[PDB]
Amino acid sequence: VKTPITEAIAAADTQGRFLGNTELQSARGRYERAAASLEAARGLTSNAQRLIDGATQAVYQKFPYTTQTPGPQFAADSRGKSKCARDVGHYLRIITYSLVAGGTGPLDEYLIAGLAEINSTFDLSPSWYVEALKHIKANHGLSGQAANEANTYIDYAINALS
Amino acid sequence: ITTAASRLGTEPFSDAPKVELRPKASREEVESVIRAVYRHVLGNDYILASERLVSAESLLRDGNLTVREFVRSVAKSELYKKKFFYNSFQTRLIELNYKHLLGRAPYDESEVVYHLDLYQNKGYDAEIDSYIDSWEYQSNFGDNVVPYYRGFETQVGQKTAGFNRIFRLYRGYANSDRAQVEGTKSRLARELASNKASTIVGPSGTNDSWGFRASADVAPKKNLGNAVGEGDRVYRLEVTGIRSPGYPSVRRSSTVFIVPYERLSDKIQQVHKQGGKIVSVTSA
Amino acid sequence: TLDVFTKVVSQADSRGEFLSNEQLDALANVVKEGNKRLDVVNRITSNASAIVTNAARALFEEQPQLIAPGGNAYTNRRMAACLRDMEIILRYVTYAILAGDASVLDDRCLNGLRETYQALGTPGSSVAVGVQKMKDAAVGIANDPNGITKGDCSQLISEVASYFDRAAAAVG
Amino acid sequence: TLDVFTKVVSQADSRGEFLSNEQLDALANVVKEGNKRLDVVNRITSNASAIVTNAARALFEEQPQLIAPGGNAYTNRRMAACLRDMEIILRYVTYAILAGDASVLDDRCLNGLRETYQALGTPGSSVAVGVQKMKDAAVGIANDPNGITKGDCSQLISEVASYFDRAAAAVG
Amino acid sequence: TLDVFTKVVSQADSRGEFLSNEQLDALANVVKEGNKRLDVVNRITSNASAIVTNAARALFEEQPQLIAPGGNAYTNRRMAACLRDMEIILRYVTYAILAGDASVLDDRCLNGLRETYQALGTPGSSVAVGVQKMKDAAVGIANDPNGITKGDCSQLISEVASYFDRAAAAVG
Amino acid sequence: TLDVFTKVVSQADSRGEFLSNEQLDALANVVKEGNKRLDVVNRITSNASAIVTNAARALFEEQPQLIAPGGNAYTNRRMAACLRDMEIILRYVTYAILAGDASVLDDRCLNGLRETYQALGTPGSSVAVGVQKMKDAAVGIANDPNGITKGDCSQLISEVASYFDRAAAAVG
Amino acid sequence: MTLDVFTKVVSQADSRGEFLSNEQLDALANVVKEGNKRLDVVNRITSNASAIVTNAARALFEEQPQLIAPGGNAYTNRRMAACLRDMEIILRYVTYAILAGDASVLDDRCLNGLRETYQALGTPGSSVAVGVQKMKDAAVGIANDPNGITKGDCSQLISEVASYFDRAAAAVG
Amino acid sequence: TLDVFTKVVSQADSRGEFLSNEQLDALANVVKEGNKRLDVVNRITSNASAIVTNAARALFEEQPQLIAPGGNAYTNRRMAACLRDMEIILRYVTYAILAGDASVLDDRCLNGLRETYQALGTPGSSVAVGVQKMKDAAVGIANDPNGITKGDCSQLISEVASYFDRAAAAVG
Numbered sequence A: 001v002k003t004p005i006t007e008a009i010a011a012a013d014t015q016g017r018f019l020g021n022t023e024l025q026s027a028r029g030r031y032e033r034a035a036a037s038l039e040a041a042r043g044l045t046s047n048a049q050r051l052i053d054g055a056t057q058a059v060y061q062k063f064p065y066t067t068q069t070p071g072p073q074f075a076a077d078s079r080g081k082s083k084c085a086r087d088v089g090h091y092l093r094i095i096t097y098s099l100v101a102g103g104t105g106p107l108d109e110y111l112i113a114g115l116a117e118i119n120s121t122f123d124l125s126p127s128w129y130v131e132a133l134k135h136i137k138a139n140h141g142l143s144g145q146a147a148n149e150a151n152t153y154i155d156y157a158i159n160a161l162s
Numbered sequence B: 001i002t003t004a005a006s007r008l009g010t011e012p013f014s015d016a017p018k019v020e021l022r023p024k025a026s027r028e029e030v031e032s033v034i035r036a037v038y039r040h041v042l043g044n045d046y047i048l049a050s051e052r053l054v055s056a057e058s059l060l061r062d063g064n065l066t067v068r069e070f071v072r073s074v075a076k077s078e079l080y081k082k083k084f085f086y087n088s089f090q091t092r093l094i095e096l097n098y099k100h101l102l103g104r105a106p107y108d109e110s111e112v113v114y115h116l117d118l119y120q121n122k123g124y125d126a127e128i129d130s131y132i133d134s135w136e137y138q139s140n141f142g143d144n145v146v147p148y149y150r151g152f153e154t155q156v157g158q159k160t161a162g163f164n165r166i167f168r169l170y171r172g173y174a175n176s177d178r179a180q181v182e183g184t185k186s187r188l189a190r191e192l193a194s195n196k197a198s199t200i201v202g203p204s205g206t207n208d209s210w211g212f213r214a215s216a217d218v219a220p221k222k223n224l225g226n227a228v229g230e231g232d233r234v235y236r237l238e239v240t241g242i243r244s245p246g247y248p249s250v251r252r253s254s255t256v257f258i259v260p261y262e263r264l265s266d267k268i269q270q271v272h273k274q275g276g277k278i279v280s281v282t283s284a
Numbered sequence C, D, E, F, H: 001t002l003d004v005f006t007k008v009v010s011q012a013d014s015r016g017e018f019l020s021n022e023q024l025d026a027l028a029n030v031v032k033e034g035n036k037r038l039d040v041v042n043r044i045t046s047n048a049s050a051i052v053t054n055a056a057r058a059l060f061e062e063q064p065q066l067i068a069p070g071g072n073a074y075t076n077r078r079m080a081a082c083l084r085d086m087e088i089i090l091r092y093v094t095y096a097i098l099a100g101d102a103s104v105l106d107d108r109c110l111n112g113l114r115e116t117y118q119a120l121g122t123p124g125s126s127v128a129v130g131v132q133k134m135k136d137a138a139v140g141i142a143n144d145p146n147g148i149t150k151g152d153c154s155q156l157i158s159e160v161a162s163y164f165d166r167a168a169a170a171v172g
Numbered sequence G: 001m002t003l004d005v006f007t008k009v010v011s012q013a014d015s016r017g018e019f020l021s022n023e024q025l026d027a028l029a030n031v032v033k034e035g036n037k038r039l040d041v042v043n044r045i046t047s048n049a050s051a052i053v054t055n056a057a058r059a060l061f062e063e064q065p066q067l068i069a070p071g072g073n074a075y076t077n078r079r080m081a082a083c084l085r086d087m088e089i090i091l092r093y094v095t096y097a098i099l100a101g102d103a104s105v106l107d108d109r110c111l112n113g114l115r116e117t118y119q120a121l122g123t124p125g126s127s128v129a130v131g132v133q134k135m136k137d138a139a140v141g142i143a144n145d146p147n148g149i150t151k152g153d154c155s156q157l158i159s160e161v162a163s164y165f166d167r168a169a170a171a172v173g
């Protein structure tokens, strides 16, 4: 699965050669680069419960019909709202997973793989989840270069949504 | 594999020259190109006159169509679909298409996952294209190179679990792919997802012992117990076909017996008394 | 292909919880001890071709029938066959030290290697006498006191030799 | 790939006799009831996508750990994996009702499916709880009459449900 | 060895909940449909020896080289070998109808049978041509209208034939 | 692919000595007898198509169910297919007499042929009744006294029949 | 399994299902006629059975001298007695093959799984067949020598006595 | 691949309007005459092999140097080359009458055929002397008064002969 340490391996393995300095340069970046990525993981893990209920009530604001229309897909009764905090709470897990991995791999393999297939069948509009993730990237309270770090992977999930 | 080539039957494929259509064709080489495509892509099934694909051989003589775009025309035909596609399971198709066109065994699980997603949204028409329009095909086969058996060789980093599986795909020179002794079911679907690689049984006939494929509930490959031997010196044994009173005394043949070093002298005499033949003897 | 970074994700996905703070303090030591790992790998790959023949001065001198007429390392293609994949042990052990976990080692050198080595007719146990001779030369180079600032290589060093011992266990 | 028309040929070839007159009176009833099946088949394929999610509204609600963290339908490509091939049951059951004989069903859904379903780690028995939930919705649509001339369809329906029961037997 | 009664316990243990009321209404139909199952088994076992030879009047007449010199049913202990275990199919299919679930069938006739049948050299596909000929005679005896009070045994007839189809799938 | 010339090299390489003078006197007789061998191959290949049907005038007349409805030589591609395979016996036996050693015969007709012949369902023993009928016609053709200067090639003739007996042993 | 010259010409004759032809019985009549020579000849191998094995072990170890030197697989004393324990088992089954007259009893015991153990143990497999050839050089030297025995051609037996050793060397190397 | 049904869609898509009622009255006429089109095609394909040689009794008798030594139809694979694709004219003309529009004809026989026929060296004009001889025999068969209900086939016949004239124009 996609990781800068893995991407050095799978490039050098398909050539059948050893690890050159060009694969070994790349390993260095995660080490230097990561130090600021693990700063972004603790910023989201500690503020996790504020961010989920901060998000699942922000999507109810912009889409008030989602709590009113009686549908299995729609979050009309409590069972949808129970599956609301499950789904949005699944997003902050995988975002924090792809932070400490350094790559988009866990985001690519757990979340966005086959997302167009599932949202068409269950009629879940992807405009809902992109509205929650814009709330997360503006309200995580992160600062510095770590604020850039979570902001890529959130926005990477946004582009895969649309 | 100089020494093991005879046992493998890989002696024909070892020093076999690639067929290699020239930029200017001649009739003696073109029919020799079509024969070696027909053997490898169709797994040596006999082709009669109605099966000869007389129109697609017609295109080849002109030189307009290269070898690689000829192989897609024989794979997309109903002829190749009548033999393989309509009976076989869909995982059985994937190990065939890797064997027919790329010439090797499916080594990783991700290749079976990825190829089923392609067949579903786009079709088996577009699935044959994914083998041919791939980098593993273009690197080892040019546009004018007839595909061959690349499985026996090291193949630039191919997993050595893949090397065992190629002998489980085909059983020798005289076999075809509709004619193996397991028929319609898939052969490398269990070993691929379990990530265990069973015994390289040699092909038949020159080997006295051939009837051992990986059973459903086999005892584990590496033991952990002492196995009642004063010291840890345990060798795994695989027998093919045990003849005895077959209902009460030997209810299941082709099973492993896990005997340590001290009684291995005794154990091989016990197996041979029933008449079963040993396949493999693996330490543990 | 797994890692130290990705394997502590993959079991954490199977239990479905957020990553704990003591797992992140564990990975913070991996980043901290990360620079040392790169240095060790660099010295192995720069002395990669020098290890293999110096192991082949003893892999064949200790069991001298192998080269002698009759052994499976006798003829010249056969001899170049156990240098074409003596280095593939080093090609994947260096991938294991780079990744930091032996899960990329066990798909290539440990998966079906013990099956071919009774199908071909080669002595399987005569490999692991010399992979140990590689480990005796690999950790001798990776430990060097010349040209490198002093640092603790004790943790990086021991579990480098664990990858060779896994490389010898699944062949013998 | 066999049929009702071709299977009564294939056993008649194995005995090597001409086709009897009561076999042709049997096939004349097959042609006679042929029009209804096309009508029956078209209703399944037009409600094909509506069946699968409505079965997935109970396949996962009844065994709720499957999508909860840890189950094999948990992550998103794993979830799209049991919609990728929940429909392939419907893709080949509709081929079986079209052909009129289950010999095209047993090469694709019944042949090696029980082998992969212990190789992957998926619960095999948790499929056939929901293929029965497909059959409860498939024969509810195929029987329901709206804007269609009425004739007894009892014979076609019972052995439509026999194809689902064969589809559940070789997985469980 | 599992049942209908015990398998609806065993998945209910894995989820760790009390048994629901609609599972008990399901089992109440099993007790209600229970008497019919006993009757079906009784008629099979009383005509057990009559089925096997009447299947052997066609298993060998249709593929006549098997008996002829060279085939694997040629000599006399070889012939008594495919009557020794033609009945073991009936010995475990009748155990499956008694238990009501095929989980006792798949450990004895379906587990390692396809492995021995290429180790011995017997045609595996030439078994499942005649196990189908057993099913044609088993459900004919089972459906008899003589000596038994009329009742609907349709569930048993179709899923009695599902046990033979599972018995033919893992051999062929 | 081995020879008489190359096999007496290959064991002489395995012992690693120079070729002895009585091995060269052995090969000098092989060159001396070389002309006789060439004549035999030419005679066989010129009557190659005449042998196969004249063997097929007895391979099917002696076991007449094979082409009768039900046998595996019944339909027309099954008839043609068997004939194509039958000659390939002559295609590789003539390669064996040319090379002078059966090591090229055992990779093609003897290697996996007994495995396919139980996978397909063809009678394996019904091949070696007619390969013997080829040998009865092959050594009859070789023995002809017309158009060839007389010499004693009886030694060459007997071990021509040994190649057919090896060709019949690994199929039956 | 155990087959013969008498029983193998039955077993293929059963598979074709015909009566035994007269030229097969004239073939077996020569086997009975040439039968007496085999017994006398085979008695000479078993009477010099222990003398062959050590005289092969004066060259099996002298030609490849690291094998008994420290490190080789014939080094220690039970390891040395291990390749005399089963150097004779080659002679135990080759003499069974000449008695039966067909190598079908040889291929179940020395040729069946022997090449599998010989890479599982770690012993050199090719270093066996250098000395089984040295047994054949001493076996046909004893079986041919005519000492106090009436002289008749023994050529058919000798050539195919050495064929059993060559089959015994092929499946180990 | 286009049709009569699909080409009146494809220009109607390019103008982006709904299909007019007089286009549907045009397509209704085709359905009425649909049976006639099917009948004509069946007759041609049943006499397909009889047309080609009867055209080859005049294609070569009229220009007799072609099979005489020197001509491009001289040797035997060259002769079988102009029967392997004399029928491909009939293979695609019958596809054109089935589709009812020559748009499937012009991709296979008319697209690059005039380019190969000067690259090979074959006379291009000596094809269209005999494709006219096919048309003289094709419309003679498709116009029979026996065994078919009588209706004028002229509307069909003249534009059957238009497909042969298009088949002769792009070769000559």
Ligand SMILES: CCC1=C(C)/C(=C/C2=NC(=C\c3[nH]c(/C=C4\NC(=O)[C@H](C)[C@H]4CC)c(C)c3CCC(=O)O)/C(CCC(=O)O)=C2C)NC1=O
Residues within 6 Å of the ligand: A056, A059, A066, A072, A073, A074, A075, A076, A079, A080, A081, A083, A084, A085, A086, A087, A088, A090, A091, A110, A111, A118, A122, A124, A128, D057, D060, D067, D074, D075, D076, D077, D079
């Ligand atoms: C680990 C990453 C991961 C996520 C996030 C995920 C989401 C996911 N949410 C689903 C359904 C659902 N998703 C929602 C959520 C919503 N619908 C609404 O009305 C609200 C607008 C919104 C929440 C804010 C609801 C209510 C369902 C049930 C819909 C149905 O059953 O048809 C489904 C299909 C059925 C299921 O198993 O429950 C998936 C696969 N799956 C994953 O593997």
Ligand SMILES: CCC1=C(C)/C(=C/C2=NC(=C\c3[nH]c(/C=C4\NC(=O)[C@H](C)[C@H]4CC)c(C)c3CCC(=O)O)/C(CCC(=O)O)=C2C)NC1=O
Residues within 6 Å of the ligand: B001, B002, B003, B004, B152, B153, B154, B155, B157, B158, B159, B160, B163, C059, C066, C072, C073, C074, C077, C078, C079, C081, C082, C083, C085, C086, C088, C089, C108, C109, C113, C116, C120, C121, C122, C123, C126, C127
């Ligand atoms: C005692 C010292 C000794 C060694 C080590 C040795 C190796 C050796 N490995 C060989 C082949 C091989 N070697 C490998 C091993 C590998 N290929 C892969 O794909 C993997 C990357 C890699 C293992 C990690 C394989 C799969 C073959 C068979 C290749 C073939 O048959 O073409 C061969 C040629 C054929 C043979 O006899 O089996 C030799 C001589 N020989 C020796 O005498």
Ligand SMILES: CCC1=C(C)/C(=C/C2=NC(=C\c3[nH]c(/C=C4\NC(=O)[C@H](C)[C@H]4CC)c(C)c3CCC(=O)O)/C(CCC(=O)O)=C2C)NC1=O
Residues within 6 Å of the ligand: B055, B057, B058, B059, B060, B061, B062, H059, H066, H072, H073, H077, H078, H079, H081, H082, H085, H088, H089, H108, H109, H113, H116, H120, H121, H122, H123, H125, H126, H127
């Ligand atoms: C005067 C009467 C006359 C005709 C008609 C004729 C045809 C003819 N076409 C030939 C080849 C050919 N014919 C075709 C034509 C076709 N193949 C296809 O793929 C299409 C289906 C089809 C056209 C619709 C092609 C492409 C070749 C070249 C094939 C090759 O070179 O192998 C050849 C052999 C090689 C040659 O000289 O070019 C002959 C003799 N010869 C004659 O003397």
Ligand SMILES: CCC1=C(C)/C(=C/C2=NC(=C\c3[nH]c(/C=C4\NC(=O)[C@H](C)[C@H]4CC)c(C)c3CCC(=O)O)/C(CCC(=O)O)=C2C)NC1=O
Residues within 6 Å of the ligand: B243, B244, B245, B246, B247, B248, B250, B251, B252, B253, E059, E066, E072, E073, E078, E079, E081, E082, E083, E085, E086, E088, E089, E108, E109, E113, E116, E120, E122, E123, E126, E127, E130
């Ligand atoms: C309850 C699970 C179970 C089964 C099923 C079983 C079957 C079974 N059948 C056997 C043999 C055999 N089975 C057959 C069967 C047949 N050959 C034909 O040609 C016929 C078509 C067919 C019968 C219809 C034959 C012929 C043998 C003897 C094979 C031999 O002697 O090589 C053997 C070993 C040989 C023996 O001891 O007789 C077993 C284990 N054992 C078990 O524990």
Ligand SMILES: CCC1=C(C)/C(=C/C2=NC(=C\c3[nH]c(/C=C4\NC(=O)[C@H](C)[C@H]4CC)c(C)c3CCC(=O)O)/C(CCC(=O)O)=C2C)NC1=O
Residues within 6 Å of the ligand: A021, A024, A025, A028, C035, C036, C038, C039, C040, C042, C142, C143, C144, C145, C148, C149, C150, C151, C152, C153
């Ligand atoms: C892939 C290319 C590459 C290499 C080769 C590399 C090596 C490398 N080794 C370093 C440190 C170091 N490397 C060592 C290694 C050792 N000291 C000992 O006394 C031991 C014997 C030995 C380990 C066995 C030590 C002790 C340090 C101290 C600094 C640190 O902890 O990183 C550093 C820290 C930053 C710097 O030196 O500027 C670098 C750059 N960095 C790269 O980007």
Ligand SMILES: CCC1=C(C)/C(=C/C2=NC(=C\c3[nH]c(/C=C4\NC(=O)[C@H](C)[C@H]4CC)c(C)c3CCC(=O)O)/C(CCC(=O)O)=C2C)NC1=O
Residues within 6 Å of the ligand: B089, B090, B091, B112, B113, B114, B116, D059, D066, D071, D072, D073, D078, D079, D081, D082, D083, D085, D086, D088, D089, D108, D109, D113, D116, D120, D121, D122, D123, D126, D127, D130
């Ligand atoms: C054309 C006929 C055909 C079918 C039907 C088929 C199924 C099939 N499903 C698979 C996995 C799977 N199957 C499922 C489906 C399920 N698991 C669950 O949790 C649910 C209970 C259930 C769906 C209702 C899932 C989630 C996977 C992925 C499991 C894994 O990756 O380990 C796999 C192995 C991996 C793969 O390529 O994706 C196969 C071969 N293959 C075939 O060729």
Ligand SMILES: CCC1=C(C)/C(=C/C2=NC(=C\c3[nH]c(/C=C4\NC(=O)[C@H](C)[C@H]4CC)c(C)c3CCC(=O)O)/C(CCC(=O)O)=C2C)NC1=O
Residues within 6 Å of the ligand: D035, D036, D038, D039, D040, D042, D142, D143, D144, D145, D148, D149, D150, D151, D152, D153, D156, D157
């Ligand atoms: C391939 C395109 C195609 C379809 C779809 C088709 C269907 C079709 N179904 C028909 C009849 C019918 N179809 C049904 C079907 C049923 N009635 C019930 O109450 C049951 C629940 C159900 C079966 C499960 C019945 C009862 C009839 C009455 C007429 C007849 O027997 O054909 C007929 C007779 C002619 C007509 O209706 O004009 C047509 C056309 N014909 C076609 O050409």
Ligand SMILES: CCC1=C(C)/C(=C/C2=NC(=C\c3[nH]c(/C=C4\NC(=O)[C@H](C)[C@H]4CC)c(C)c3CCC(=O)O)/C(CCC(=O)O)=C2C)NC1=O
Residues within 6 Å of the ligand: E035, E036, E038, E039, E040, E042, E142, E143, E144, E145, E146, E148, E149, E150, E151, E152, E153
């Ligand atoms: C031809 C299709 C057909 C079948 C199969 C059939 C069976 C059948 N068995 C019945 C009863 C029964 N069947 C049994 C049989 C047995 N109980 C035991 O404990 C014994 C072990 C076993 C006999 C060996 C018993 C005890 C009853 C009780 C009711 C009665 O006397 O009929 C009844 C009574 C009515 C009902 O159950 O609804 C039916 C229907 N009826 C049919 O129409």
Ligand SMILES: CCC1=C(C)/C(=C/C2=NC(=C\c3[nH]c(/C=C4\NC(=O)[C@H](C)[C@H]4CC)c(C)c3CCC(=O)O)/C(CCC(=O)O)=C2C)NC1=O
Residues within 6 Å of the ligand: B044, B045, B046, B173, B174, B175, B176, B179, F059, F066, F071, F072, F073, F078, F079, F081, F082, F083, F085, F086, F088, F108, F109, F113, F116, F120, F122, F123, F126, F127
């Ligand atoms: C040169 C090396 C070589 C050999 C030997 C070879 C044999 C061979 N014979 C085959 C089939 C076959 N072989 C036979 C032979 C016979 N059936 C009978 O009943 C008769 C007694 C007998 C002829 C006398 C038949 C009938 C088939 C076709 C079986 C079928 O289509 O079901 C097949 C399976 C593929 C196919 O049939 O297309 C192979 C590979 N192929 C090779 O490449």
Ligand SMILES: CCC1=C(C)/C(=C/C2=NC(=C\c3[nH]c(/C=C4\NC(=O)[C@H](C)[C@H]4CC)c(C)c3CCC(=O)O)/C(CCC(=O)O)=C2C)NC1=O
Residues within 6 Å of the ligand: F035, F036, F038, F039, F040, F042, F142, F143, F144, F145, F148, F149, F150, F151, F152, F153
């Ligand atoms: C009926 C039993 C019988 C056979 C088989 C036989 C063959 C035979 N072929 C001979 C010669 C020969 N045979 C050939 C044959 C050929 N050389 C080639 O390069 C060609 C490819 C091939 C012909 C196609 C040749 C060239 C000679 C040279 C001597 C001569 O002219 O007779 C001779 C001359 C005397 C001798 O060799 O001792 C014999 C005996 N004689 C017999 O009594």
Ligand SMILES: CCC1=C(C)/C(=C/C2=NC(=C\c3[nH]c(/C=C4\NC(=O)[C@H](C)[C@H]4CC)c(C)c3CCC(=O)O)/C(CCC(=O)O)=C2C)NC1=O
Residues within 6 Å of the ligand: B261, B262, B263, B264, B265, B266, B268, B269, G067, G073, G074, G079, G080, G082, G083, G084, G086, G087, G089, G109, G110, G114, G117, G121, G123, G124, G127, G128
């Ligand atoms: C009846 C058929 C049959 C045979 C032949 C057989 C052989 C056999 N040889 C063994 C060991 C052995 N065999 C040898 C043989 C040799 N060492 C050399 O260097 C020489 C080339 C060669 C002697 C000529 C050695 C050294 C061992 C023990 C190796 C060890 O334990 O490390 C063992 C291990 C345990 C035990 O002996 O009890 C068996 C079972 N078993 C059988 O059932």
Ligand SMILES: CCC1=C(C)/C(=C/C2=NC(=C\c3[nH]c(/C=C4\NC(=O)[C@H](C)[C@H]4CC)c(C)c3CCC(=O)O)/C(CCC(=O)O)=C2C)NC1=O
Residues within 6 Å of the ligand: G036, G037, G039, G040, G041, G043, G143, G144, G145, G146, G147, G149, G150, G151, G152, G153, G154
């Ligand atoms: C050096 C090559 C050579 C051999 C091998 C040889 C053996 C040999 N053994 C013979 C006889 C015989 N050999 C035996 C031997 C035995 N019968 C038994 O039942 C006993 C078990 C066994 C002795 C232990 C017997 C009984 C005869 C009877 C004839 C006679 O007294 O010579 C004869 C008499 C002539 C003949 O058979 O044609 C020959 C040739 N002669 C040779 O020139």
Ligand SMILES: CCC1=C(C)/C(=C/C2=NC(=C\c3[nH]c(/C=C4\NC(=O)[C@H](C)[C@H]4CC)c(C)c3CCC(=O)O)/C(CCC(=O)O)=C2C)NC1=O
Residues within 6 Å of the ligand: H035, H036, H038, H039, H040, H042, H141, H142, H143, H144, H145, H148, H149, H150, H151, H152, H153
């Ligand atoms: C010689 C010039 C000529 C032609 C070509 C001709 C054909 C022709 N085919 C007809 C009918 C027909 N033709 C067919 C033919 C078929 N339907 C199918 O579905 C089958 C696939 C196919 C046969 C294989 C059928 C079914 C009819 C129905 C009317 C009838 O029975 O004649 C009729 C009846 C009268 C009419 O259509 O106006 C005509 C005219 N009549 C002529 O004068």
